[PDB]
Design an enzyme around this catalytic site. Structure first.
Site, short mmCIF file in Angstrom:
data_model
loop_
_atom_site.label_atom_id
_atom_site.label_comp_id
_atom_site.label_asym_id
_atom_site.label_seq_id
_atom_site.Cartn_x
_atom_site.Cartn_y
_atom_site.Cartn_z
CG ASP A 35 -1.79 1.19 1.30
OD1 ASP A 35 -1.90 1.90 0.30
OD2 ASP A 35 -2.39 1.39 2.38
CB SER A 199 -2.16 14.38 -13.42
OG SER A 199 -2.57 14.15 -14.70
#
Ligand code: NA
EC number: 3.4.23.22
Length: 330
Positions: A35, A199
């Site tokens: 994770d 992004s």
């Protein structure tokens, strides 16, 4: 040193991925959920409340010659999905894919929430976010990656998750055979303890690319792609009959649909998520309503590039002094 381990989807939907991890001496092999959005290595154990264990493999420290109680240390964690676990701490030898760390904090669960008990395939979590998020008190502990780092050939690990197929986690090296083209690196903020990046924009299907900054985290422990409501609405508007359902808890679509791809930007590069990756199947067994793999992040307080996005790429988690993320097509 290096390590290389195969990671396997737990079910037909890629809800999560499990990777075998050796703990203790002689080895006890547990299947952990790696994770990148958390920083605790915790396991089902011989200490876990018996009614909260249903099929998991447990770690038994009393059977490990290298286990030592980390006296006075406790831990307690809550995840973004509402699940939780807590317990005490041992140090032990932990190996992943042939890479060994001695003295790793292994957080032994005394209690786990119902979602963990109900998932017999996951024996615990191995956190790969920054050690600043580790919950051990009163002495915070390091992640497996942070403890391995100085021994690694390169201070990196890579995630290469499969679509309905196994993939790989590598530690200490880039496998130049595992991706196509070049790797595009992007800056990381560690301010919140995550692999947080920005992004450069998105496209829906064959549509034009929208240049827009989307801050979010690279999180292998989250199934879906959670993005701003504007972006998510623009995606699902291209699917006839798709709608957001408050009863189901997100966007659903007719199981008869063909889904468009979704592209996200990494600098001037583009990662394309095929439409098929965004189909999470019937909302309940036999339903003709299907659950979407792109969902709104509104109310979660962060955008999350979970497995839906990451499994479209070869992803480099660069833990050098200035951390960065890399993405390549594959
Ligand atoms: Na679900």
């Amino acid at each position: 040193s290096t390590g290389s381990a195969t990671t396997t989807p737990i079910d037909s939907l890629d809800d999560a991925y499990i990777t075998p991890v050796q703990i203790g001496t002689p080895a006890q092999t547990l299947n952990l959920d790696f994770d990148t959005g958390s920083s605790d290595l915790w396991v089902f154990s011989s200490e876990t409340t018996a009614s909260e264990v249903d099929g998991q493999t447990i770690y038994t420290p009393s059977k490990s010659t290298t286990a030592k109680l980390l006296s006075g240390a406790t831990w307690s964690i809550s995840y973004g999905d509402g699940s939780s676990s807590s317990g005490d701490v041992y140090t032990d030898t932990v190996s992943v894919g042939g890479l060994t760390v001695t003295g790793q904090a292994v957080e032994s669960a005394k209690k786990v929430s119902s979602s963990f008990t109900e998932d017999s395939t996951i024996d615990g979590l191995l956190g790969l976010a920054f050690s600043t998020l580790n919950t051990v008190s009163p002495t915070q502990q390091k992640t497996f990656f942070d403890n391995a780092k100085a021994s690694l050939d390169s201070p990196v690990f890579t995630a290469d998750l499969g679509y309905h197929a196994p993939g790989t986690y590598n530690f200490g090296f880039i496998d130049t055979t595992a991706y196509t083209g070049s790797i595009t690196y992007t800056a990381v903020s560690t301010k919140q303890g995550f692999w947080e990046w920005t992004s450069t924009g998105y496209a829906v299907g064959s549509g034009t690319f929208k240049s827009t900054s989307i801050d979010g985290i690279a999180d292998t422990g989250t199934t879906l792609l959670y993005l701003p409501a504007t972006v998510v609405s623009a995606y699902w508007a291209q699917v006839s009959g798709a709608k957001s359902s408050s009863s189901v808890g997100g966007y659903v679509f007719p199981c008869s649909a063909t889904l468009p791809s979704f592209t996200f930007g990494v600098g001037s590069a583009r990662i394309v998520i095929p439409g098929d990756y965004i189909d999470f199947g019937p909302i309940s067994t036999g339903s003709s309503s299907c659950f979407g793999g792109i969902q709104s992040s509104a109310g979660i307080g962060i955008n999350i590039f979970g497995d839906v996005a990451l499994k479209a790429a070869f992803v480099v988690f660069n833990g050098a002094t200035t951390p960065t993320l890399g993405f390549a097509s594959k």
